[PDB]
Amino acid sequence: KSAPATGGVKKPHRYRPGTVALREIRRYQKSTELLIRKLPFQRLVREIAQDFKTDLRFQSSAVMALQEASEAYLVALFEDTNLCAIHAKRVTIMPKDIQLARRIRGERA
Amino acid sequence: PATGGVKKPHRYRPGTVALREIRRYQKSTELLIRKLPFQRLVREIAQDFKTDLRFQSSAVMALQEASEAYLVALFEDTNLCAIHAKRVTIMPKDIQLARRIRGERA
Amino acid sequence: RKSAPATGGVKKPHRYRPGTVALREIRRYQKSTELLIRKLPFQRLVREIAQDFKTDLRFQSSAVMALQEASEAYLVALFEDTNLCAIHAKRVTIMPKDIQLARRIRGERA
Amino acid sequence: QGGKTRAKAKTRSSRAGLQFPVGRVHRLLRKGNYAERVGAGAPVYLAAVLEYLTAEILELAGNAARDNKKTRIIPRHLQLAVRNDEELNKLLGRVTIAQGGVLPNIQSVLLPKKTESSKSAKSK
Amino acid sequence: KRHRKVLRDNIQGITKPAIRRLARRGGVKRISGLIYEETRGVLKVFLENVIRDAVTYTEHAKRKTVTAMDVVYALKRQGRTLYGFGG
Amino acid sequence: GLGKGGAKRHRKVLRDNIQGITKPAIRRLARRGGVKRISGLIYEETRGVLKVFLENVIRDAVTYTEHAKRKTVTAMDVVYALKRQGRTLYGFGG
Amino acid sequence: KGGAKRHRKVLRDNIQGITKPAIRRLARRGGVKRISGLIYEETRGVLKVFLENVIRDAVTYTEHAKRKTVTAMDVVYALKRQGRTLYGFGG
Amino acid sequence: KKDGKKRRKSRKESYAIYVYKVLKQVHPDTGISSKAMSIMNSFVNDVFERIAGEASRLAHYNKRSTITSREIQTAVRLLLPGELAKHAVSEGTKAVTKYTSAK
DNA sequence: CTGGAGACTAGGGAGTAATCCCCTTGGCGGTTAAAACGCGGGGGACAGCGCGTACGTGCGTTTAAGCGGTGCTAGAGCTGTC
Lengths: 109, 106, 110, 124, 87, 94, 91, 103
Description:
This is part of a larger assembly, with 3 copies of chain A, 1 copy of chain D, 3 copies of chain E and 1 copy of chain H.
Chain D: H1 22-31, H2 42-67, E1 72-73, H3 75-84, H4 86-91, E2 95-97
Helix pairs in contact in D: 1-2, 2-3
Chain E: H1 16-25, E1 30-31, H2 35-61, H3 68-78
Helix pairs in contact in E: 2-3
Chain H: H1 16-26, E1 31-32, H2 34-61, H3 69-79, H4 83-100
Chain A binds one DNA strand through helix 1 and helix 2.
GO cellular component, one term (chain D): nucleosome
Main location (chain D): nucleus
Keywords (chain D): Acetylation, Chromosome, DNA-binding, Isopeptide bond, Nucleosome core, Nucleus, Phosphoprotein, Ubl conjugation
């Protein structure tokens, strides 16, 4: 019917591999939000920093600032990675693109 | 013996001397850009910004060294883009992309 | 006895089958006494570990030989127990499942 | 106090066995207006750090000079050292050396065969 | 009563929809499966450089808690300056 | 013809300033980058790329020169400009 | 090549010097007919932990004697204490 | 006092002479080219400003009017990576303890 | 081998530098108390791999004409003086 699936039939024009992405592209560009769960992230920053400082303590602004900086950095990598894929006649970002993006910027080496 | 009638010349196939040129140039330590053409270019550009200016005969050399390093490093980054796109040639879209990922193109 | 790696031939059913040279190797290596693992690469391993433990430390030939000989004997004894763990299942290949069981039974890791 | 050696008996560089102008470090800190006060132990710490950086690169340059079979160190030796080690590449990633040249880079397509680097056992 | 657990890799808490959302935020139609690990791997190295800078500020000030000021100082050097939370 | 032709340049005014970096010159720099193949359009595009770098560095240099009440640009101004341009240069001003 | 001149990456590789033929001989001496691939890595790991425990005791013996050089007596004390007594060196 | 001398005593802060002495103290018989001398003359000065820049900023952040070995050691760890940081501080604390042990 | 500037010393009264007196200043470590974001919950569309398929891209080869670099020949901007 509208979108049956179930046992399965030859589907007509439906939500194609890019269709919901555009909906997610529109949604995440229409508004500003954080796309990373805070509680596991709070564990993540504390876990790695345990070796450098034992019983490390954080602040409410500090964890959010680190998440925002990390989230922006990943997004900044994605915009460069996506353009590299198109440069390689592809619309899917792949690990070959991510290797070049950090190397050319000097972050990888 | 004669002006015309020589046999087939001993010519390398396309893309051959690049291997020989590669080994020579990385071992070099000199500017590959002629100094005199670069000298005239910098004065013309600076004329718009300042009506009258002079140079110390060392800043001109310093500008060439920085420009050559800026281009060579960009060319090295450009070469990485070409292989990533499955091609030996570096298309003009490679340099534009290469400076886009870096802090350039802004 | 002809090998002939060339295209001609479909190989042979018995061409030093997996384990037959091992059956030859077990006889040779259980008939003589020697140090099995490499000496100099093991010597660097002992020096590197001690360097982090202590900034300055000298070594002598007798000390490094004793450590290597004990380690080889410890590994060989472990392999005998690990192979006994291997025979528990209907298999003749030593696997990480066996080494975990053998070590836990002993005082190591438990 | 004392009643003898009312002159420059020794320098601040010789205090720690150093050879760098520790007094110049103190003057440069005041010249640059880094702070209204600079305590003792800062220039001697900075001079030792600067001396260590000077010595390590020079030793690598001397070793690189031996590779090129030349007693005096040409600027080419500096470029090889700063890029060979990841330790020095991080500090001088965006740094150019005058007349230093570049390292003999190579890539997959930069070879006779199609994307293969089976050739080895000679400098790479 | 101060129980402690030897460090286990909890960086895998970043889930595929979370990586998908970040990719979709950057205008990505399709994302490779291996990049899901690489994106978390890139997060690890980027975080590690930041905290290594961050803990040095706190160590110099003998202050255990991580201040928003100290985070910005580490980020300002690396170029990842984040406006807000500081003054 | 092999000589005595009309395409012999013969001028240095209002020309060759931007084309002084000819085809071998860009090839030489690219070969120092190690590259193997050069696109035909890369030569004209590289002219624009070099323009943005030359303009920015000189832009700081002229402002430095005006501040020092001098009519001559020194290597120190270039070095100071290059520090904030992401391409640091060592070997000048000493 | 004087001075520090120390290059230390995040990883270490001197453990890998002990390679498959070295592991193979021990496996054959123990009668093992065939050895799996990951055993090579685990055997190197078993060597690392076994050596680390031995050196911990031996280091304490060496420093208690104010010695900057390790000797056969010091390693015997660590081995004898741990139960893996060695006969042939020292006495 | 002058009056016959060119008075061309203009001074640029340079480290080439001290760098040359360090070269002889690590390589007994080795020379340096004047072309490479200009490279390291600006290099050490740039390193000085970069390190002092970290120290000055660190002091300002902590609302302190003084800089000592604590700030510079913080700067050395903060810039120098890996073994370089470990050895640079090792030379750093070596210098201060001998400085305090002198008359 | 013939000049010149810098790096070492000899001296003289103030500044910054270690030292040490007292009242107010910030993080820690324990308690607290109602809102909040996290665990697993069970299937659905929606999209990564792994075959096509169906084709315009970059490589493989040979002429060409200026194009690189070098000798002269006169000047033209860049070193130093007061």
